Write an enzyme that holds these catalytic residues in place. Structure first.
Site, short mmCIF file in Angstrom:
data_model
loop_
_atom_site.label_atom_id
_atom_site.label_comp_id
_atom_site.label_asym_id
_atom_site.label_seq_id
_atom_site.Cartn_x
_atom_site.Cartn_y
_atom_site.Cartn_z
N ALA A 65 -2.05 2.91 9.84
CA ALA A 65 -1.38 4.12 9.41
C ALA A 65 0.13 3.98 9.52
O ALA A 65 0.63 3.21 10.34
CB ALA A 65 -1.85 5.30 10.23
N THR A 89 0.12 8.81 8.56
CA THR A 89 -0.40 10.14 8.88
C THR A 89 0.17 11.21 7.95
O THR A 89 1.38 11.25 7.71
CB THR A 89 -0.09 10.52 10.33
N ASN A 114 10.51 2.83 15.94
CA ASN A 114 10.64 3.88 14.94
C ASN A 114 10.61 5.27 15.54
O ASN A 114 9.92 5.51 16.53
CB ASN A 114 9.52 3.76 13.90
N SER A 185 2.12 10.50 19.32
CA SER A 185 3.42 10.64 18.67
C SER A 185 4.55 10.27 19.63
O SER A 185 4.56 10.73 20.78
CB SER A 185 3.60 12.07 18.17
C1 LIG Z 1 7.67 2.80 10.74
C2 LIG Z 1 6.33 3.03 11.40
C3 LIG Z 1 5.62 4.18 11.07
C4 LIG Z 1 4.38 4.42 11.65
N1 LIG Z 1 3.71 5.57 11.32
C5 LIG Z 1 2.47 5.83 11.88
C6 LIG Z 1 1.79 6.99 11.53
O1 LIG Z 1 2.28 7.78 10.72
N2 LIG Z 1 0.56 7.25 12.09
C7 LIG Z 1 0.01 6.37 12.99
O2 LIG Z 1 -1.08 6.61 13.49
N3 LIG Z 1 0.69 5.22 13.34
C8 LIG Z 1 1.92 4.94 12.79
N4 LIG Z 1 2.59 3.79 13.13
C9 LIG Z 1 1.97 2.85 14.14
C10 LIG Z 1 1.14 1.75 13.48
O3 LIG Z 1 0.06 2.34 12.80
C11 LIG Z 1 0.58 0.78 14.52
O4 LIG Z 1 -0.30 1.47 15.38
C12 LIG Z 1 1.68 0.11 15.35
O5 LIG Z 1 2.75 -0.25 14.52
C13 LIG Z 1 1.17 -1.12 16.09
O6 LIG Z 1 0.79 -2.11 15.16
P1 LIG Z 1 1.57 -3.52 15.09
O7 LIG Z 1 1.85 -4.03 16.48
O8 LIG Z 1 0.73 -4.53 14.34
O9 LIG Z 1 2.87 -3.30 14.38
C14 LIG Z 1 3.83 3.53 12.57
C15 LIG Z 1 4.55 2.38 12.89
C16 LIG Z 1 5.79 2.13 12.31
C17 LIG Z 1 6.51 0.87 12.69
O1 LIG Z 2 5.74 9.00 11.98
C1 LIG Z 2 6.08 8.62 13.13
O2 LIG Z 2 7.22 8.87 13.56
C2 LIG Z 2 5.10 7.85 14.00
C3 LIG Z 2 3.81 8.28 14.13
C4 LIG Z 2 2.92 7.58 14.92
O3 LIG Z 2 1.79 7.95 15.04
N1 LIG Z 2 3.33 6.47 15.55
C5 LIG Z 2 4.63 6.04 15.42
O4 LIG Z 2 5.00 5.04 15.99
N2 LIG Z 2 5.50 6.73 14.64
#
Ligand SMILES: Cc1cc2nc3c(=O)[nH]c(=O)nc-3n(C[C@H](O)[C@H](O)[C@H](O)COP(=O)(O)O)c2cc1C
Ligand SMILES: O=C(O)c1cc(=O)[nH]c(=O)[nH]1
Ligand SMILES: Cc1cc(Nc2ccc(S(F)(F)(F)(F)F)cc2)n2nc(C(C)(F)F)nc2n1
Length: 367
Positions: A65, A89, A114, A185
């Site tokens: 996501a 999300t 982020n 969050s």
């Molecule tokens: C810019 C950004 C936006 C993200 N937005 C969401 C989100 O909207 N909803 C969510 O559940 N996780 C969000 N995540 C978290 C990712 O889904 C993931 O759980 C996290 O980046 C760990 O994965 P990774 O180590 O492979 O990067 C976001 C991450 C980043 C970097």
């Molecule tokens: O949209 C975001 O700011 C966000 C949501 C989320 O679930 N995880 C995250 O790292 N960022």
């Protein structure tokens, strides 16, 4: 292994060096929207199949996501070699999110932070986007058996949390293969309330439609969407076990471990920054969290891996720890479009060298 991938990865590495993150992200989402990104048309190893309940994945890697919040680039990303993607999300109403710049990346540590703030086009418009995809999927050979989950959450200033999620389900629940609830969050009694209420809304979609399932569930499974929940890693052992109980009482369909973390201070470029950290530094924290919940739930609840997955090796740690499936985010940023092809290669070869018959056999092999 084509030049297509290779040439694109040069362009990406270049963009990664010079250009702002959220600007890069949107640029390549756009390239994917106009379908000029490469394809992975390889048959996936039947020995690396996996599932979560009756939800089957042709391979164990998907996108997490936050990558395609608005569902604008679903075909192109799936055709890079992923078995599934999690959009959102999303929220019932569009949000702008926090002020820019709000995403930064440290290349040496292969990490990201982020504070996006749940920016999205709102449930209505994204549902229209998912519908259009679902229509394209009926025509495209390469999208068959590919899974699309939807991450759903509450508006910044919500009257009531449940009602936010309820609206989203009613609108988009028909086009989803599964629904992800993220309370991560950057009491458990209130959680159980949320989880239940979600299962009930999904169950209500079935009841209040006259159509049989084929024409009711305009998704891939042709069944009602599963219910996962995504957990943040910044909890104490008491919180985790309290939640662990809940997930069992609710009989939830799976848990996505995990979201970003706020407890990393050893990244120099990030000392100015607020938000949640992801990438390599989140890897070891994430994996441990999987072992815990896997133990606390006594292995009854399926797990979906997320956090610092880059290699076929990284992937296997999550699996043996207790994960059935893996999600990538940071890997695509730092390793590019080849990530799915590359990581599937690396995992297939390791399962062999580790003497595993198939992937399912390796799941949760940390006693
Ligand atoms: C810019 C950004 C936006 C993200 N937005 C969401 C989100 O909207 N909803 C969510 O559940 N996780 C969000 N995540 C978290 C990712 O889904 C993931 O759980 C996290 O980046 C760990 O994965 P990774 O180590 O492979 O990067 C976001 C991450 C980043 C970097
Ligand atoms: O949209 C975001 O700011 C966000 C949501 C989320 O679930 N995880 C995250 O790292 N960022
Ligand atoms: C070079 C680069 C690329 C990128 N994201 C990304 C990378 C690749 C693709 S894709 F999907 F190329 F096919 F894999 F388009 C889509 C999105 N991001 N995302 C960010 C961030 C961290 F801001 F979200 N920075 C990036 N830098």
């Amino acid at each position: 292994y084509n030049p297509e991938f290779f040439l694109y990865d040069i362009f990406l590495k270049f963009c990664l060096k010079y250009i702002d993150g959220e600007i890069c992200h949107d640029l390549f989402l756009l390239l994917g929207k106009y379908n000029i990104l490469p394809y992975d048309t390889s048959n996936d190893s039947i020995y690396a199949c996996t599932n979560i309940k009756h939800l089957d994945f042709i391979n164990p890697f998907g996108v997490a996501a936050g990558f395609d919040k608005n569902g604008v680039c679903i075909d192109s990303i799936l055709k890079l070699g992923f078995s599934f993607i999690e959009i959102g999300t999303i929220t019932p109403r569009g949000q702008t999110g926090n002020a820019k710049p709000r995403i930064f990346r440290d290349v040496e540590s292969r990490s990201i932070i982020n504070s996006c703030g749940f920016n999205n086009m709102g449930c209505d418009k994204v549902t229209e986007n998912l519908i259009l995809f679902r229509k394209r999927q009926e025509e495209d050979k390469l999208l068959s058996k590919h899974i699309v989950g939807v991450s759903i959450g509450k508006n910044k200033d919500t009257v009531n949390i449940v009602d936010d999620l309820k609206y989203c389900i009613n609108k988009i629940g028909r086009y989803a293969d599964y629904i992800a609830i993220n309370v991560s969050s950057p009491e458990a009694g209130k959680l159980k309330n949320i989880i239940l209420s979600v299962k009930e809304e999904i169950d209500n979609l079935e009841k209040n439609n006259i159509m049989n399932d084929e024409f009711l569930w305009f998704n891939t499974t042709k069944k009602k969407p599963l219910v996962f929940v995504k957990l943040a890693p910044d909890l104490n052992q008491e919180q985790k076990k309290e939640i662990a109980d809940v997930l069992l009482e609710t009989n939830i369909d799976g848990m996505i471990i995990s979201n970003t973390t706020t407890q990393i201070n050893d990244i120099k470029s990030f000392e100015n920054k607020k938000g949640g950290v992801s990438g390599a530094k989140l890897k070891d924290i994430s994996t441990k969290f999987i072992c815990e919940m896997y133990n606390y739930t006594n292995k009854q609840i399926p797990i979906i891996a997320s956090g610092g997955i880059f290699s076929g090796l990284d992937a296997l740690e999550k699996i043996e720890a207790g994960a059935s499936v893996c999600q990538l985010y940071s890997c695509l940023v730092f390793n590019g479009m080849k990530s799915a092809v590359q990581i599937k290669r690396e995992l297939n070869h390791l399962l062999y060298q580790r003497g595993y018959y198939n992937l399912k056999e390796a799941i949760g092999r940390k006693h």
